[PDB]
A paper describes a structure:
Superposition of both structures did not reveal rearrangement in the presence of amino acid (aspartate) ligand in the active site. Binding affinities for AtGH3.6 were analysed by MST. Affinities for IAA and PAA were similar and at around 60 µM concentration. The superposition of AtGH3.6 with AtGH3.5 shows the conservation of the amino acid binding site and, thus, similar specificity. Our attempts to obtain structures with bound products IAA-Asp or PAA-Asp were unsuccessful due to solubility issues of these ligands and a loss of crystal diffraction upon co-crystallization with AtGH3.6.
Residue numbers in the entry: 13 to 375, 388 to 609
């Protein structure tokens, strides 16, 4: 009903006003519920909280923690401990974060109830968008949504990414008919374990219903960029399926075949049109040509994903890029209340019902005083930067997420945050988040191949190259040759693979499982290249004694400068090794 939908939207927006006005009280209430329900859990009992639920005591008693501090408890639960270790409710599963510890995905505990809070955040997005872009209930959204690799812990609990867990839950699979969540992709195309068949069926379903499409997207920019690349490679096969009304024999999954069968009909004119647009040399504006009623591209382009803004603007011909929410495996955080703002102006308003949020000022061990005086959600100051600290319903207490956020403004009393970065992350193409330490150790393993040739790496840096789809990590190497035997290309290709083999499981899964990352490249640079970069820094006030070559570079003019001094480049000849789950298991 049009009246019931408008009433529902108005109530969700009034909920936002209520919780942003009474933000500190909602925060107080959330922490009280977490601490009363889990009063008798081992973690809080051993720290002496003694069933006290007040905020003042919690901040004085409980320590601020990293994943490594609580890994003993997490591993015990993963090995089968069903007692109340971190939570009074049973841990339903582990949500495997893209952030890693010891090169393995961090295991974030969750409880069945947490899906109600994830569904609450998702329920606020269309009521917010509807204010700015009306009429979205009269069409469909073409979203490319994917389930990723799953595994089981030794104790039998599922270990899977938060999005795979949500799509497989009844909150998404058995969701009620909402015209605002009417997607072109049937649930069976999303819930398909074969990534190729999932992408192929979703792209075909998207093309079959192209006139009904009012918005396009994916969770992340990289994933949507890959869907466009998939169409670049398979549009002749896909147009054939439209013309004949028969799905490709490569789609062997019977559940996908039945779901696609209820949409796919023979349509030679649509096939001719799809062929005519894709045949064109320039794909600038292919999204608006194939899906002409698209109002915006809905992908996250904040954080590392901002490197994709030029590619997305090319394929969309400058349609608005919309960043709707900020979330993690450990906790869903906030929504963007200005979805039509410019990507550089995006701020996320944290919803105080999700978790009890705390803020560590930034300008790593924390002093007793610093842990005690962590800033509450409503007390953060405009323009100041903070690390996000979270206390969740699923057994995390004063957990450092590692995200650095800046205060852009306030919605009533609730702060709005610009996303700065995930601390220490230097390279990323899709979900992979390679930190400076993983990279340094991967390069240290690779330079052992140069030792028999009496060669050494004088200096190196890196950047994430998005000139190709899927993107790849690029390493710039400057060698010091002290021997007489020239180094053959196979040795440098062995270095490329040795780096890849030492990178974390998310990087290696990206190369092996979903093909979201391309082969790593080592670009050799002329002698004196890194001394020329040092000359740029010395001119800008850097000392010779304090200068160290950065391990990673993002600023395009410096990447261009290094690329201009390249002699030869080498690529990894094969994928690194990868299998689902932790190597220990
Ligand atoms: N809207 C967003 N903009 C920028 N970074 C984001 C956004 N949403 C999630 N992230 C990052 O991804 C992390 C969660 O990764 P994961 O736990 O694998 O889902 C967050 O803590 C952020 O660092």
């Amino acid at each position: 009903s049009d009246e019931s939908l408008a009433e529902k939207n108005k109530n969700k927006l009034q909920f936002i006003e209520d919780v942003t006005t009474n933000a500190d009280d909602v925060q107080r209430r959330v922490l009280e519920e977490i601490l009363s329900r889990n009063a008798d859990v081992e973690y809080l009992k051993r720290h002496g909280l003694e069933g006290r639920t007040d905020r003042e005591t919690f901040k004085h008693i409980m320590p601020v923690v990293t994943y490594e501090d609580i890994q003993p408890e997490i591993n015990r639960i993963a090995n089968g401990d069903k007692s109340q270790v971190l939570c009074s409710n049973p841990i339903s599963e582990f949500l495997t974060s893209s952030g890693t510890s010891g090169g393995e995905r961090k295991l974030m505990p969750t409880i069945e109830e947490e899906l109600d809070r994830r569904s609450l955040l998702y329920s606020l997005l269309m009521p917010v968008m509807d204010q700015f872009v009306p009429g979205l209930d009269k069409g469909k959204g073409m979203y490319f949504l994917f389930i990723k690799s799953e595994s089981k812990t030794p104790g039998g609990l599922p270990a899977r990414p938060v999005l795979t867990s949500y799509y497989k839950s009844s909150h998404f699979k058995n969701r009620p008919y909402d015209p605002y969540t009417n997607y072109t992709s049937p649930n069976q195309t999303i819930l398909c374990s074969d990534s190729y068949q999932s992408m192929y069926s979703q792209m075909l379903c998207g093309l079959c219903q192209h006139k009904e499409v009012l918005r396009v997207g994916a969770v992340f920019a990289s994933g949507f960029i890959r869907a466009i690349k998939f169409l670049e490679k398979h549009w002749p096969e896909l147009a054939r399926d439209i013309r004949t009304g028969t799905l490709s024999s490569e789609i062997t999954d019977s559940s996908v075949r039945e779901a696609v069968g209820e949409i796919l009909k023979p349509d030679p004119k649509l096939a001719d049109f799809v062929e005519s647009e894709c045949r064109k040399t320039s794909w600038q504006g292919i999204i608006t040509r194939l899906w002409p009623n698209t109002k915006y591209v809905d992908v996250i382009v904040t954080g590392t994903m901002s490197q994709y803004i030029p590619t997305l603007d090319y394929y969309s011909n400058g349609l608005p890029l919309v960043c709707t929410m900020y979330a993690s495996s450990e906790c869903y955080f906030g929504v963007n209340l200005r979805p039509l703002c410019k990507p550089s102006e995006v701020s996320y308003t944290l919803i105080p019902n999700m978790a009890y949020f705390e803020f560590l000022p930034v300008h790593k061990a924390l002093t007793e005083k610093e842990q005690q005086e962590l800033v509450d959600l409503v007390d953060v100051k405009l323009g100041q930067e903070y690390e996000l600290v979270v206390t969740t319903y699923a057994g995390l207490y004063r957990y450092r997420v590692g995200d650095v956020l800046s205060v852009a403004g306030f919605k009533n009393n609730a702060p709005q945050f610009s996303f700065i970065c995930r601390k220490n992350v230097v390279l990323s193409i899709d979900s992979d988040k390679t930190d400076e330490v993983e990279l340094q150790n991967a390069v240290k393993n690779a330079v052992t191949h140069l030792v028999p040739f009496d060669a050494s790496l004088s200096e190196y840096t890196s950047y994430a190259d998005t000139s190709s789809i899927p993107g790849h990590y690029v390493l710039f190497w400057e060698l010091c040759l002290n021997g007489n035997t020239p180094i053959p290309p196979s040795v440098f290709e062995d270095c490329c693979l040795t780096i890849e083999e030492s990178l974390n499981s998310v990087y290696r899964q990206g190369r092996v499982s979903d093909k979201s990352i391309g082969p790593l490249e080592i670009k050799m640079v002329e002698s004196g290249t890194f001394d020329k970069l040092m000359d740029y820094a010395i001119s800008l006030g850097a000392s010779i004694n304090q200068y160290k070559t950065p391990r990673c570079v993002k600023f395009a003019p410096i990447i261009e400068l290094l690329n201009s001094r390249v002699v030869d480049s080498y690529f990894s000849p094969k994928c690194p090794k990868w299998s689902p789950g932790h190597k220990q298991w």
